[PDB]
Structures are given as C-alpha cells and as structure tokens.
Amino acid sequence: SHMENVDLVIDLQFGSTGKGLIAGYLAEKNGYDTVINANMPNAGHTYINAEGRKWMHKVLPNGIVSPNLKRVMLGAGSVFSINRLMEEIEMSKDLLHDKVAILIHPMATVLDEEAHKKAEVGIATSIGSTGQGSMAAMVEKLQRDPTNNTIVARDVAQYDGRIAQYVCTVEEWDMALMASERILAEGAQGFSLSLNQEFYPYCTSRDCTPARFLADMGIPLPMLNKVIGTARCHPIRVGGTSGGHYPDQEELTWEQLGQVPELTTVTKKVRRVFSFSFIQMQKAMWTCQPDEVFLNFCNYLSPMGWQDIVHQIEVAAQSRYCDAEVKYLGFGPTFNDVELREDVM
Ligand SMILES: Nc1ncnc2c1ncn2[C@@H]1O[C@H](COP(=O)(O)OP(=O)(O)CP(=O)(O)O)[C@@H](O)[C@H]1O
Ligand SMILES: Nc1nc2c(ncn2[C@H]2C[C@H](O)[C@@H](COP(=O)(O)O)O2)c(=O)[nH]1
Numbered sequence: 001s002h003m004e005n006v007d008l009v010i011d012l013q014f015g016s017t018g019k020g021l022i023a024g025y026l027a028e029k030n031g032y033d034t035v036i037n038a039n040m041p042n043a044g045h046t047y048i049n050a051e052g053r054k055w056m057h058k059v060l061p062n063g064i065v066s067p068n069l070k071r072v073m074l075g076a077g078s079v080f081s082i083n084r085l086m087e088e089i090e091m092s093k094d095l096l097h098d099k100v101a102i103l104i105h106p107m108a109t110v111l112d113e114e115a116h117k118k119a120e121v122g123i124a125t126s127i128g129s130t131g132q133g134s135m136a137a138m139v140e141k142l143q144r145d146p147t148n149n150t151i152v153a154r155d156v157a158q159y160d161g162r163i164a165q166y167v168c169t170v171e172e173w174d175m176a177l178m179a180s181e182r183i184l185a186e187g188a189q190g191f192s193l194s195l196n197q198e199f200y201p202y203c204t205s206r207d208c209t210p211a212r213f214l215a216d217m218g219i220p221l222p223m224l225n226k227v228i229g230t231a232r233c234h235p236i237r238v239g240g241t242s243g244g245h246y247p248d249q250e251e252l253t254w255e256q257l258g259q260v261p262e263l264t265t266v267t268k269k270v271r272r273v274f275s276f277s278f279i280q281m282q283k284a285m286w287t288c289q290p291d292e293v294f295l296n297f298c299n300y301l302s303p304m305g306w307q308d309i310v311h312q313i314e315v316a317a318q319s320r321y322c323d324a325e326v327k328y329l330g331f332g333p334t335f336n337d338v339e340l341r342e343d344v345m
C-alpha cells in the first residue's frame with residue numbers, strides 16, 4: 001500500500017553533471033531492485049566503480065550495478081539502438097543474470113541509426129545537436145502511421161528477435177513497477193536543455209524535468225519518494241552554436257579553469273563551459289524541486305569555491321520553496337570520489 005519508493009535523478013543545469021556517476025553510486029549504496037530510465041541516444045552516461053570498472057551506457061540504466069538488481073526497465077520515452085543495447089547487455093551479462101528481468105516498454109522507440117541520424121545532420125550544426133537521431137526517432141513514433149511496424153519496440157520485436165524477450169506489455173510494465181521494492185529512476189540530459197525552458201530552439205526534444213521523466217518512464221506520481229538533483233560547479237553545454245546562457249553567467253575556457261578540455265567522446269567536440277549560474281539554480285530548483293543535491297566537478301574548484309556553490313545551491317533552493325540539501329559532492333569520475341557533503345564541510 002506504501003508507494004513512495006522512486007528516487008529520481010535529475011540534472012539541474014545543461015547536462016553532463018555526472019548523473020551516470022550518482023546513478024551507479026546510489027545503486028550500490030541503496031541496493032534498488034528496480035532501475036528505470038527513458039534515455040535517448042544523445043545521452044551517454046558513465047559510471048566507474050571503486051575497482052575501476054567503467055560503464056558507458058546510452059541505453060541501460062547505470063544503476064544495473066545495484067547489488068539487489070531484479071528489474072531493468074527501459075521507459076516508453078526511450079530511443080535506443082538495438083545493436084548498442086545488445087553490447088551493453090553483453091558487457092554487463094554478469095550483472096544481468098537469469099534472475100534479472102530486462103523490460104523494454106512496448107512503446108520504447110527503436111533508433112533507425114542511418115535515417116534518424118541523417119535527419120539530424122542540420123541541427124547538429126545549427127543548434128549544436130548531438131545529431132544522434134533522438135528527435136527524428138521520436139517524430140517517427142509521433143507520426144502514428146499504422147503501416148509503420150519499424151518504430152516501436154512492440155512492432156520491432158515481431159521481426160527482430162533480439163528484443164522480443166525484453167519487450168513487455170503495458171500491464172507487465174505497471175506490474176513490474178508495482179512489484180518493485182525500491183526504484184532508481186534515471187533522468188537524462190539537463191533542466192536548461194528542456195524543450196520548454198527559455199533557450200528554444202537551442203534545446204532538446206523534450207522537457208528534462210521530474211514530471212516529464214516520470215511520464216516518460218510511466219511512473220505514477222505517488223511513487224516518487226525523492227528527487228536527486230545534479231549540478232556541476234561550472235555548467236557546460238556541448239560545442240558549437242549550442243545556445244545561450246543565463247544573465248549571471250559567462251562562458252569560460254578550459255584553459256581558464258586549468259582543466260583538460262572536456263569533449264563528447266565520439267565526435268571529440270570540445271564542451272562549452274560556463275561559470276555557475278544562481279539564476280539557473282533558482283529556475284531548476286523551482287521546477288525540479290530536488291530533495292537532495294549531488295554537486296559534482298568540485299575537483300575543478302578550491303574548497304572555498306565549491307563550499308560557496310553548496311551554500312548558493314541551498315539558498316537558491318530555499319528561495320524557490322525547495323528544501324534541497326546538497327548531500328553528495330563529486331571530486332572525480334569514480335565511486336571513490338563521491339563524498340557525503342557532511343564529511344568534507
Ligand atoms: N567530478 C568529475 N570529475 C571529472 N570527470 C568527471 C566527474 N564526474 C563525471 N566525470 C566524467 O565526465 C563525464 C560526465 O558525464 P556523465 O556521462 O556521467 O554525465 P551525465 O550522466 O550527466 C550526461 P547527460 O547530460 O547525457 O545526461 C563522464 O565522462 C564522466 O566520466
Ligand atoms: N550534455 C548533454 N547535452 C545534451 C544532451 N541531450 C541533449 N543535449 C543538448 C545538446 C544540444 O545543445 C541540444 C540539442 O541536442 P539533441 O537533443 O541531440 O537534439 O541539447 C545530453 O544528454 N547531454
């Protein structure tokens with residue numbers, strides 16, 4: 001009868017805050033039986049455990065590292081490459097054992113790598129889109145053409161056997177959520193990337209908010225226990241003409257931060273980096289309303305600098321009626337680098 005059991009990870013900036021790290025960290029600490037996401041191919045999530053084992057996932061939740069893993073769920077809002085999904089499953093087959101059920105929502109979108117990426121070539125330069133086919137795939141799903149049996153996982157399962165064992169029904173989806181003890185819902189992208197945030201058209205193809213991530217994962221609202229918001233000390237955007245920033249922030253350089261230029265690994269496009277925006281935090285806090293915050297890339301600043309950003313985040317939260325507590329701090333890309341805030345300050 002108790003229902004609040006979903007911990008939803010949401011980005012509070014323009015993405016790449018290390019949601020992949022907090023997902024894997026929380027999965028290992030909290031031992032969720034169900035890990036769920038609604039990812040699109042624009043988002044790649046990296047987790048590195050204490051032993052140095054690395055997971056770079058575009059389809060599978062990073063939370064599959066949970067010691068009590070029972071269910072892996074790919075939301076209806078998912079846009080995925082079956083090839084990639086196959087590699088990710090194979091890569092973690094030790095974790096995705098016989099007693100682990102992988103559930104692909106019947107309406108999850110199958111990425112047509114050639115056609116969908118080709119359709120995004122223009123926005124790949126114009127809005128600095130990742131051009132991974134995410135929206136092109138989503139639009140093909142929205143066409144709702146009864147003659148198109150190649151876009152949703154339910155229809156693709158009938159000719160592509162690779163996903164037939166994973167593709168479930170809507171009732172199976174709802175029951176898997178019902179039967180779950182503790183859920184880790186993994187949000188992707190970033191609050192300010194939301195289609196309905198102010199940087200349109202320099203945004204993604206959906207809102208990157210708790211309400212949209214819960215919707216895209218088919219999670220009933222009473223299931224939400226807590227929202228874990230993620231933030232970087234210096235927010236980033238992808239390279240190119242990727243959009244504007246907030247009035248209280250400035251575009252910095254990697255040389256200015258004294259850091260190794262961050263880039264999207266496949267294309268090697270250098271990420272745009274910005275100073276921390278309090279306005280962004282207020283905007284994110286207002287909509288996202290996190291209960292807990294993970295402040296990452298603290299290793300880019302002095303103790304004074306990131307300690308200041310912690311207090312900023314907490315006051316930006318209080319100002320927008322949000323009781324968010326910076327509970328976790330990131331000092332590197334691995335599990336060992338996630339510190340409890342109360343231990344370092
Ligand atoms: N504190 C830290 N210091 C240095 N590198 C870090 C770090 N935290 C994460 N990283 C690395 O930087 C990148 C952070 O991206 P990750 O893929 O985890 O972010 P994310 O899950 O938020 C991406 P998305 O915006 O697509 O949702 C990865 O390459 C990760 O290994
Ligand atoms: N860091 C990051 N940027 C993303 C992600 N998804 C979308 N974006 C950004 C890149 C572009 O500036 C913009 C549009 O990209 P796309 O959603 O691929 O069309 O959103 C993501 O998961 N991570």
Ligand SMILES: N[C@@H](CC(=O)O)C(=O)O
Nearest residue numbers: 043044263264265266267
């Ligand atoms: N941009 C994501 C995904 C990728 O490039 O493969 C990353 O930096 O990991």
